[PDB]
Amino acid sequence: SHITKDMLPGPYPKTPEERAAAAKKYNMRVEDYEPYPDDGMGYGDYPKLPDRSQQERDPWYDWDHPDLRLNWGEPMHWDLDMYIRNRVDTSPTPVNWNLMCKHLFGFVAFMLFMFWVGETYPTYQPVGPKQYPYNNLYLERGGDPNKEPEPVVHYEI
Amino acid sequence: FLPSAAYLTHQQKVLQLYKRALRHLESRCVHRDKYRYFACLLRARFDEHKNEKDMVKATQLLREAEKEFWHGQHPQPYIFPESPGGTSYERYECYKVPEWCLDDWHPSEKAMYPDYFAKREQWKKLRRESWEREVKQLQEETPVGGPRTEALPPARKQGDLPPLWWHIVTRPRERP
Amino acid sequence: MLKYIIPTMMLMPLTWLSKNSMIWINTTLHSLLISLTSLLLLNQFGDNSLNFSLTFFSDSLSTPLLILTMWLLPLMLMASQHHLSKENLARKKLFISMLILLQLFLIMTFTATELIFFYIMFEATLVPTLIIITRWGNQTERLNAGLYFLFYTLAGSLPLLVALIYIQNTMGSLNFLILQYWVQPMPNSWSNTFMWLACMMAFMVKMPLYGLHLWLPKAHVEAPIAGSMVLAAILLKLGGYGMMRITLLLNPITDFMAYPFIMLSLWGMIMTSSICLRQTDLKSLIAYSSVSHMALVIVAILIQTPWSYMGATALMIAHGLTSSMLFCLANSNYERVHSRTMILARGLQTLLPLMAAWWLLASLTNLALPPSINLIGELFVVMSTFSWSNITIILMGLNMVITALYSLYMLITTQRGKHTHHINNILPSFTRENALMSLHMLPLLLLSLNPKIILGPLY
Amino acid sequence: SGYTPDEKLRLQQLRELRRRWLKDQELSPREPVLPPSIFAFTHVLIPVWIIHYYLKYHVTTKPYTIVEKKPRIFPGDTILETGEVIPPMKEFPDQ
Amino acid sequence: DAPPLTLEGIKDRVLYVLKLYDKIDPEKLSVNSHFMKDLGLDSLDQVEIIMAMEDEFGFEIPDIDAEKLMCPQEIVDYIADKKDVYE
Amino acid sequence: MNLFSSLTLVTLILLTMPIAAINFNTHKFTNYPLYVKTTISCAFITSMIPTMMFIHTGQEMIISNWHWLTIQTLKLSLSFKMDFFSMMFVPVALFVTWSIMEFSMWYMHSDPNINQFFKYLLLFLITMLILVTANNLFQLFIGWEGVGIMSFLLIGWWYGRTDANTAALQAILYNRIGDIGFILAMAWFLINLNTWDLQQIFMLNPNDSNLPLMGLILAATGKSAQFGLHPWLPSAMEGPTPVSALLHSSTMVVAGIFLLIRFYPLTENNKFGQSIMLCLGAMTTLFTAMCALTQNDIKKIIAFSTSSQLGLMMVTIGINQPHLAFLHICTHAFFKAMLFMCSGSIIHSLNDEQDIRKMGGLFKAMPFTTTALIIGSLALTGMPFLTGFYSKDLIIESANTSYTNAWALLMTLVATSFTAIYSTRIIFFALLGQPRFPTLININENNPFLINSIKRLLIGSLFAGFIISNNIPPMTIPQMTMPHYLKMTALTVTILGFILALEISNTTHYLKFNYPSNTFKFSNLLGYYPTIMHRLTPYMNLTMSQKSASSLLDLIWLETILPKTISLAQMKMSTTITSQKGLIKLYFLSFLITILISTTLLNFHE
Amino acid sequence: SFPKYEPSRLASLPTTLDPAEYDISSETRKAQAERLAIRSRLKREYQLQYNDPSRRGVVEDPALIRWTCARSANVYPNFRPNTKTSLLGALFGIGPLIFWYYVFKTDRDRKEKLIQEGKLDRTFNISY
């Protein structure tokens, strides 16, 4: 048995009674409940949350769910399928974001630029070609065993 | 965000920053003697201004301390390898079998362990034996129209055990 | 195969005049007798089919699917107690006889000579599953699920009949052999495209293709377990069977009008494997998994390669087995926690220490672990599609990565790590559930040893 | 500040209860539970016997089966079956 | 993987490492001795004390419990609770 | 002779009886580690025999039996070979894994689920063996994904600790990227060479081979934890310790370059392929060399070390030199098996605290394991001149005497200097510092099994490297003629790296506390690659799965295309047709307009 | 000392430095007190549902069932066709399909005309 009214169709107009019923049904702060708004992407009148929720909330508070970081009565953020720990970990980064991405792409592009600078400038010891016996080693390349040799014998140095 | 109250205090925030900054200096500062030097330098820095009777000066220096701390924190601090974040973090959760179980066993397997099961049966009789009057009278007597706190008082009134105790006492031993 | 048909008619009234507490053993024992009897047929040798007076014949397009259905019937049946146990004896007999009738028309459907008889037995397959899922669907929109089911399958399957009557009165009778022997190509006119579009579109709706696959997931989340397994395995693989039958005629225009369907199935395969990553309602993940695999099947059927048809029937048989099993484990979990939602039922490593091994083995067969026949199917389809266009292998491998990802996420989410310490009602797993596990997977591995049977008529 | 003393009292009753529960969890009545070379080389030799019975007969009767990059005869050595030398490598000079 | 502990031994260890500290005295030192109340030392040194207990016993005690212990008896009780050491 | 084939087949078939034994047991075993010990011991002593026959004669052979699905012009039996690589690799892996069995007897002494652990580990051994014996490429794929799945389960052993099963999820994801590359290789091999069998692919030389080589390089950088797909390796270090030793020392990470070593006749040509080889290997080598500074976990240091070693082997295949890379596999295998086992001895001896901090001083306290770590680290860089000298310095000499790319040689030189300096740092911070770790010390080696295992693997690292390296028929040209500063220069660079790390240490002795200067921050967060990619790409694809798939395009948009339009049209037509009232005058007027539209609008009598 | 650490869609802004915490007013403390009271009363009701010996089944969470029904079948209402919804659906539905369909037009034209000519590697191309 469960009340059909305890689901959630329809957005926030009109402003007194929708916000009253939303703060009652969702167990939230009244004027800190804010809808998405009615953007027409579905979404109902489901609450907006601060989006991180899992690498925060340090586990020494000792709430109920030991891994979901939830305490059984909350608005249960719309991305609970994805914002969990073990899927996406939104810890605060030690430095920045733009500084991180620009240094990483700068280092990788620098390595590719020097790969190309290496590819246009090869290195080699002073070493000539090999001197294969049977005219650059016929009969064990592609074939024609008695048909077309190209005679180039080596002359000594 | 804490079970006792909502605001920590200014002093509690200063103190938590003190513990975190000292732990980060521990992580920065191996060989432990230069650690002792820099740690007492930090203790000197916070006893620069013991005599602070102002409040806006204290909180603005606290915000600048958060600035100067985030400017120089360490990426992998030495977190203790049993705490959350660390290297264990319920490492030995392979055998933290909850204790509502060990009641659905086969009776020959229950014939294997006689006296422990007699003791568990009399604990369970103690559990249902003292639920109704004590816990219902305390949870209708002591709460105001809002409960408004999370730490709960014991059964200090007359007799037996404090309420709401089963899944707090009978937890696994953290070495199973 | 009338020696398969008439014991099914002699099995049904026995259940009617079976006494109390004795319906079960009688039906199970006699369906297992039918399983040995089904195993007798496997004889298809060499050049031709094995025919039988006009109505009946057998190919390896039909023989492993028929063996699959008659092996699936006791598994179906033994999944189908304990969730109608408190209901009436008469309603229980009615349900079991309804499933027996559904099996009878499925055997009729797979052992069909003419495509007209195939159409009759196609919507004969349609009708009982409606009543089953709408009556016993056990949620508030089993109504909507049965209604979407019936209207999509009729409204797609219906002009197929008119095209079949047109092929009837333009080429004489409609034996599969005459249509092997009197066929002639029909060039790129417009009416050829419309007739091909009607036939293939009826089957597209049955597959389901990505344009009309909202058909499926309500009918899987809002069904009992017997109808769930029947619906998924036998109805989708019956649709693919029917497409493999009809596509022998009308070869020269599928190169001109198959390019939208292949594209729609590939991009829908990627989108469906992405959508079954992030949903709730644990049951529905396997539903869109089946959608993704049948999209792969559709691409394999229409690119017209012998490697592709061998891999197609291998993927059909393997996914039928795996999806039926994984539905049965989902029903076991719903027996436990009364939820159907994914994130609630957690733990199940301390608790239930060997039910987890069957979850693991099922998810590894779904993952295409390399002795699973899923991998044999996917591998042959990948070989054929890289011969087909030499660049579409990227969509195949991206499907492969995402497939392993969502299947293994479905494993480790609910069933790796921590009970929520408020469930406290799970009993250790019954011998019946484990019996259904070892009835699913032991024939999968013992078929994986010598799998030369299940490959197609282009052996 | 410290504990409020009611929390101290609640904690003390839970120390008594946790001590008694862990004292329950220990068992040692000294009847705690109550229940109701040649092997090595036969374990090695019986697969050798089975798989060498298998690898002679069926594997030999199947023709294009186990096959070998042949051993490498040398220009000074001879043949076991037919039997003759290959003439040696020629003169050395500047060795 | 078996070091065992006791109550009396671990209490002696905590009282030992409190006695090791410089600017308190072993003169009037016992288990029933409050820190902020009647030993006169600051809360700053009190959290240096809790830091020393963490750095020896190898597990973080929470920041909510770096507030309200103030006496060695509750320290020994809390460490025996986190390590679950009774008979 | 059939003796050779028979003993290779019994070395395969001995790895089955414990698994079916415990599955058919029903009477509980407790000496199951003893059982695994004796069966792997006899497998080793029966696999040393055919390699003795191999170097005694040559005499290479392939076996094949029990064909199935001979469908089209191809066929496939269970078919595996024994040529030089599958000869002189298998006893190495068996010896390593038998020592890991010993160390897992002692280390996992406490968990009462040891039987399922040994089942997983031995099944993983079987599958890696099937990978390193097969010539039918489908069986190679079988071994590939099987060791991927066993790596998944064997990391995710400890349920709970969501970091660990996240690590296992990352591991299986990069194995599937290896899978897409490998099936592209199989697809091209089928469609342009009728089959996937190594004999026929060697028998022809299809010279246009850019597509399959790009697929193979994708598969190898997927499996071998290299640039772009490296971050699953320290995350995979966060499993247990014999887990880490077997899974990343001798198996499962060396299989990625093993296939490129297997395809040496195909890569004898295609210099473009070797350019891609050595450029990617140099990128990995310098990336992990720079990345392994200020990494206070021991296992992550060893992970970056073994990734740099695999970068050296990718450069080694960047030269047309497979057998030096194979010899380096053997030396590296004994090497880091012994090294992980010593590290696990340390970590379990101090209560799994596992970090460089709070571990500082260890010398003169059980000097057996400190001796083990210093033998391992001296064998790193090849202190002059040991088993680790041989493969590594033949690699750098053959790289310097080659038509190289002017950048890869310099990057591998700098990375050999850097592996010298982090070998210095693991020595100096684990052993010689003033002792920093808590009291109640339980530092214990009243233990036979660990001392036997460390004993046997340091004996292996002392001799068996040179023993394998010495008596092999050389399949290359020994260059042997290097100028000044081109033969002793490797030792020169490693010693100057020791000087540089020494002065780092002496500057660390002071009391200064200078700021981090963002190379220090570039090295901590692993070059920011695992952080920013694992925070960005699971945001992109999953947010698009929310927006397009699960919310918009599938459900609500298909419900508005097909059912809504039809249903609302039928609703409107019904509510306009049946919504009539009872004024029959209107119905007779409808009759009238029907008669008039029948007369004058459309002709009906005409 | 620093540019004060901007957040992003991924970079979490921690609760150490907001800096907008420090301008506390009385209504904000009233808000934190009401939040504490709400979590207090919900946990009290949770524990009283949670601590009976006679309870056998699940804890009967209404929040999870609320979220599942609000995510599964309470999406189709509400909905309206905007410019945003229609354009975004037409850009994510048929766009990539017509894109890869054009590239398969190109590759099939190349393959058809190529082996129409005869300059392919099909000296042996058996497994058709």
UniProtKB/Swiss-Prot annotation, chain C:
Q: What is its EC number?
A: 7.1.1.2
What is this enzyme's catalytic activity, as reactions?
A: a ubiquinone + NADH + 5 H(+)(in) = a ubiquinol + NAD(+) + 4 H(+)(out)
Q: Name one GO biological process term.
A: mitochondrial respiratory chain complex I assembly
Q: What is its main location?
A: mitochondrion
Pfam families in the record, alphabetically?
Oxidored_q5_N, Proton_antipo_M
Lineage of source species: Eukaryota, Metazoa, Chordata, Craniata, Vertebrata
- EC class: translocase
Q: How does it sit in the membrane?
A: Multi-pass membrane protein
What is stated as this protein's family in its record?
Belongs to the complex I subunit 4 family.
From which organism does this entry originate? Ovis aries
Task: List the GO molecular function terms.
Answer: NADH dehydrogenase (ubiquinone) activity; ubiquinone binding
Subcellular location as annotated: Mitochondrion inner membrane
Q: An example Gene Ontology cellular component term from the record? A: respiratory chain complex I
Task: Give the protein's recorded name.
Answer: NADH-ubiquinone oxidoreductase chain 4
UniProtKB/Swiss-Prot annotation, chain F:
> What is catalyzed by this enzyme?
a ubiquinone + NADH + 5 H(+)(in) = a ubiquinol + NAD(+) + 4 H(+)(out)
Quote a single Gene Ontology cellular component term.
respiratory chain complex I
From the Swiss-Prot or TrEMBL record, state where the protein is found: Mitochondrion inner membrane
The membrane topology of this protein is:
Multi-pass membrane protein
Source organism per UniProt: Ovis aries
One BP annotation, GO: mitochondrial electron transport, NADH to ubiquinone
Q: How does it assemble?
A: Core subunit of respiratory chain NADH dehydrogenase (Complex I) which is composed of 45 different subunits.
Name of the coding gene: MT-ND5
Record keywords: Electron transport, Membrane, Mitochondrion, Mitochondrion inner membrane, NAD, Respiratory chain, Translocase, Transmembrane, Transmembrane helix, Transport, Ubiquinone
The name this protein goes by in its record: NADH-ubiquinone oxidoreductase chain 5
The main place the protein resides is mitochondrion
Which Enzyme Commission number(s) are on file for it? Answer: 7.1.1.2
Known role? Core subunit of the mitochondrial membrane respiratory chain NADH dehydrogenase (Complex I) which catalyzes electron transfer from NADH through the respiratory chain, using ubiquinone as an electron acceptor. Essential for the catalytic activity and assembly of complex I.
